[PDB]
Each structure stands twice: as structure tokens, then as C-alpha cells.
Structure 1
Amino acid sequence: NMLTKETPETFYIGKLIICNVTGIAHIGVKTRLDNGVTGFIPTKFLSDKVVKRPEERVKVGMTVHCRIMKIDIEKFSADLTCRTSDLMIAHPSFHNINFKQAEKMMETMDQGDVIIRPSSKGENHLTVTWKVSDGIYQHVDVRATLWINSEEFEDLDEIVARYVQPMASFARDLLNHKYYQDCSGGDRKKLEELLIKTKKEKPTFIPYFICACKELPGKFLLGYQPRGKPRIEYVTVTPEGFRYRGQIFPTVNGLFRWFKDHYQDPV
């Protein structure tokens, strides 16, 4: 206490004391501490007695933090632990990850699960990714400009149950449609060639089909052949309903019942 100025009553067990190992006598690391206490780490601090020294557990030449378990600054010893453990149906999902690598973990999810992730700009941005269709995903780049408040970021449970859960419930109904098709995710080249082949078997009855677009997620596609010319009408799925010709339908069925008595105009 008169020369080194550090007694055992200051250093306690449980608190982390940074022990700088500068050398080793014969398997240990005997160095000095911050208060001049000669920190001699035993072989139990490195976990090796007949092998090389604790180079992975104690930094040779530098200071290595360890949990203080012995107060012997007057005895020329320092029981500093070299180990880091000695110092101490619509499922939600959480993250922090890369867009490419994120694509591989949302293919194992089935319809309905929503992952939360950051976004490529790497700060402030975040994105709500959900199962628009088989092989099609939405990436709501919230500031897809979905303007929100600042208070909601502390509770991440309502932005899904108010904007995406009803959206997914609305999107699932079209998947269970009687006339749904993949067409390679709505390839614009594959869709025009199907309507011209289905019209020839039954020229009187004109069928209709729905598809999602991989080229622009959240666009559904509704093609109909009033005559010998393919025609494509787009529709956006909204958190509150559907955006069809700028008219908002509360329920999934009123869209179809509005279409059955609107597609018979000459346009």
C-alpha cells in the first residue's frame, strides 16, 4: 500500500479487472495490472498446463479483460479469468440481415408468416416482408411509402396487425380462387398466349383468370378477352381493401360483384 498503492480491499471478486499479461514464467501469463499489481494468471485461467500458453485467452503484450476472482496485488498474483463467461398461423419473426440472404429464409416459411428486417441503405430504413404469393414477396419500404408516426417504433406489434394481417387475409382469398394460375409468376408473355388458347374451345363463354405479377409485387393481374385482342387490367391490394379503378371495396367479394356488371361496356 505504500509502494504499489493498491491493496486487496479495492479489488473485489466478481468485478472485471483488466489484467495485462506481458510474460509467462514457465505455462502461465505473469504480467502487471493497471494499478501496478503483478498479475500472475494461473494455468486454470488459460486452461492449459502441458500445451502452449494462454495466447487465445490472455493477450500477450496487451491488456486482456477478465473477471476479478482474487485480490493479491501485494502477493504478485492476479486471478483474472481469461474466459468471457467468467466475467459475467401468421407467426411473428425478428431479425437484422442481407436482402439476398434473407430470400433463402422466407422460402421455408409458408403463407402468412411475416419477417421483419432492415433495408439496404443500412440505417433508419426498415421493411415488412410478407408472402404476397408463391415466389412473390412484398417489401414494404416504410419511411411502398407507408407514412407512420415516431411513437409506434417502440411497439412493433400493431403495424402488422393493422396494415399487413388484413392485407394478407385479402390476398389469401385470391389464392383460393377457382381460376388461379401461376404462368411463371405472371409472365406477360405467358398470359397473352393462354387467353387465345382458352377462347377457341368455347367462343361463346369467355373465361377469366387472376394472377400476381413478379415484375411489380402487389400488382394482381386480371385479363379478359371481350374480343380477339388481349387486354390487361391491373389492381393493387391495399391494407384497407382493393384499388380497382380508384374504387375501394371493403370486402373481397364486392370487387368481383362490381366487376361482373362493369366489364360489359364497350370501353
Structure 2
Amino acid sequence: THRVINHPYYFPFNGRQAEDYLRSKERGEFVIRQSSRGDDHLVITWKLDKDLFQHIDIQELEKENPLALGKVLIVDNQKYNDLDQIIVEYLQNKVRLLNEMTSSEKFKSGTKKDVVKFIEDYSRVNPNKSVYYFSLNHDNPGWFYLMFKINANSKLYTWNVKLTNTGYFLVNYNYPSVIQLCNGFKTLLKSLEHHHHHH
């Protein structure tokens, strides 16, 4: 600490400029900035993919006096003792997970309009078979949405998924692996068709 202000990754720029600066750079780049309105809080900016940027507000605690540094930093609903661990434990997992998910064949970037036409078209080819897919949401960056259709005469169903630093969270269910998540749904779909719930 006591060096986060001049930290190597420290760069004074506006919110718009920060994204622009990272625009020419590659994915997985981050920066450290201080908010005048915060005074006791810091804001970090990072790039996800293409025209997509997100900001995270870092809150420090355990301050005994104005000259006392926050020995405890809260990030992602998690408590970290050292700043260095936060950067490494966040970028390493986020970079690998983001790259693994996007690099997944089960990843299509279709718009809301293209989603209906996509599911409807596919459903048309398979009216007697169910289908499920997921895509990136623009209204809520970082979160994933699951859409699926049982049949052409079936109503379109869409669910929401929460992204965490431990994997993927689906309606209060953590899936450490995307493969398990894919079946997880298939298993649920099978159970749903039988309306047997548990027994």
C-alpha cells in the first residue's frame, strides 16, 4: 500500500478516456484510478471484449485514523488482505474463464431480435425436439442469459445467470464447470418434462 496512488498500473484519465485507451490495447487490461467524490474509495476499470467495458469500485476498511491505511480491501463481496493478490486472483481467473466461455462453441452473440429468429428458425427445423443456448447480454454486462425452446408450439423461456469469481451461478446453483452447466440444464429439462419434480 502507500503506493497504490503511484502504482505502475496507476494512470490518470477520465472514464471515457480510460475505455478509449484500452480500446487500442488487448483484452484483460486494467487500470487504477481515484475518484474525487470518493476520497476514501478507489475505482478500477477493465475491458471485457469488443465494445464492452465495466468498472468496479474498491472500498477500503479498517481505517483507524486519517494517517492509517486500509489493511482490508473489499472486492467482489470478498475480503482481500493485499492489493497484489486482488489483481492476480481476479485477472487470472477472469481472463481464463472469460476466454474459456467465449471460446466455447456454445457461444453466439445474437441480438434480441436475432435471438427470436434464431431460436424460431432452429425450432422450425426441430419442432419435435427441444433446444437450449446462451449468449452475452448487453443490458447487463458480465451476466449471461439462458434461452431454450421445447417445441414450435411451446412458449419461449428465458432464464438469468449470475457470474461469480468461483464459476457460474445459475438460480442459486454453482456450476464449477461449463460442461456440468450444460447438462445441469438438460437434467432440469428432463425433470421438467415429467413434472415429477422430486418424486
TM-score (norm 1): 0.55
Percent identity of equivalent pairs: 24
| Greater relative CO, 1 or 2 (CA 8 Å, sep 6+) | 1
CA deviation digits over 1:180-208, x for unaligned, max 9? Answer: 2222xxx4343223211221123244443
Residue 209 of structure 1 corresponds to 133
CA deviation digits over 1:126-161, x for unaligned, max 9? Answer: 233333333222322233xxx876215695321122
Distance 1:206 1:107 in 2: 40
RMSD: 2.8
Q: Does 1:240 align with 2:169?
A: no
- Contact 1:180/1:211, CA 8 A, preserved across alignment: yes
Distance 1:120 1:263 in 2: 50
Distance 2:31 2:133 in 1: 30
CA deviation digits over 1:213-253, x for unaligned, max 9? Answer: 12112111111112332221111110112211111233333
Query: In structure 2, the residue corresponding to 1:111 is in which secondary structure?
Result: coil
Distance 2:92 2:33 in 1: 17
Residue 167 to residue 202, structure 1, CA distance change in 2 (3 Å): same
Structure 1 residue ranges (4+ consecutive) displaced by more than 6 angstroms after TM superposition: none
Q: Does 1:128 align with 2:62?
A: no
TM-score (norm 2): 0.71
Structure 1 residue 103 displacement after superposition: 1.6
Query: In structure 1, the residue corresponding to 2:141 is in which secondary structure?
Result: coil
CA deviation digits over 1:75-96, x for unaligned, max 9? Answer: xxxxxxxxxxxxxxxxx84322
Residue 141 of structure 1 corresponds to 57
Distance 1:173 1:103 in 2: 23
Structure with the higher helix share, 1 or 2: 2
Residue 119 of structure 2 corresponds to 195
Structure with the higher strand share, 1 or 2: 2
Distance 1:120 1:249 in 2: 39
Residue 206 to residue 128, structure 1, CA distance change in 2 (3 Å): farther
Structure 2: runs of 5 or more not aligned: 1-7, 63-69, 74-80
Distance 1:162 1:204 in 2: 45
Residue 115 to residue 192, structure 1, CA distance change in 2 (3 Å): farther
Distance 1:124 1:189 in 2: 43
Aligned residue pair count: 170
Question: Pairwise mapping of residues 159-174 of structure 1 onto structure 2 (< 5 A)?
Answer: 159-174=86-101
Structure 1 residue 120 displacement after superposition: 7.3
Structure 1: runs of 5 or more not aligned: 1-91
Distance 2:150 2:142 in 1: 25
- Contact 1:131/1:168, CA 8 A, preserved across alignment: no
- The counterpart of 1:251, out of the listed 164, 177, 191, is 177
CA deviation digits over 1:90-123, x for unaligned, max 9? Answer: xx84322211111211222222222333347353
Residue 169 to residue 135, structure 1, CA distance change in 2 (3 Å): same
**Rg comparison, structure with higher value:** 1
- What one-letter code is carried by the residue in structure 1 that aligns with 2:177? T
Distance 2:9 2:189 in 1: 42
Query: In structure 1, the residue corresponding to 2:181 is in which secondary structure?
Result: helix
Query: In structure 2, the residue corresponding to 1:261 is in which secondary structure?
Result: helix
Residue 240 to residue 205, structure 1, CA distance change in 2 (3 Å): same
Distance 2:135 2:35 in 1: 28
Residue 257 to residue 94, structure 1, CA distance change in 2 (3 Å): farther
Residue 182 to residue 238, structure 1, CA distance change in 2 (3 Å): same
